[PDB]
Design a protein around this ligand. Sequence first.
Ligand code: NAG
Lengths: 43, 49
Amino acid sequence: IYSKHTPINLERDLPQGFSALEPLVDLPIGINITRFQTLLALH
Amino acid sequence: TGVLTESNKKFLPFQQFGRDIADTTDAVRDPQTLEILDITPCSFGGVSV
Ligand SMILES: *[C@@H]1O[C@H](CO)[C@@H](O)[C@H](O)[C@H]1NC(C)=O
């Protein structure tokens, strides 16, 4: 679950630069994953 | 085998070791107290007569 937070100027697209993604948490799960989905917080 | 000295290397919190280009351990982390130690080989050289 490599992660990185970076400041941005404006919201057009991805910037130019090298932000190295430090390891954050390793998980010992070891299950079969082929598909994924992302939730949204609806009020 | 070597001399364990204090180090000023800026280890990341997920990093335990530091490696030389010959794949030998240059820095180590103490498992009891979270400190970083530099390993330097002991004094050696050649003798001519
Ligand atoms: C092991 O040592 C560290 C540092 O001396 C200490 O913080 C930790 O609580 C110790 N663990 C146990 C189980 O006593």
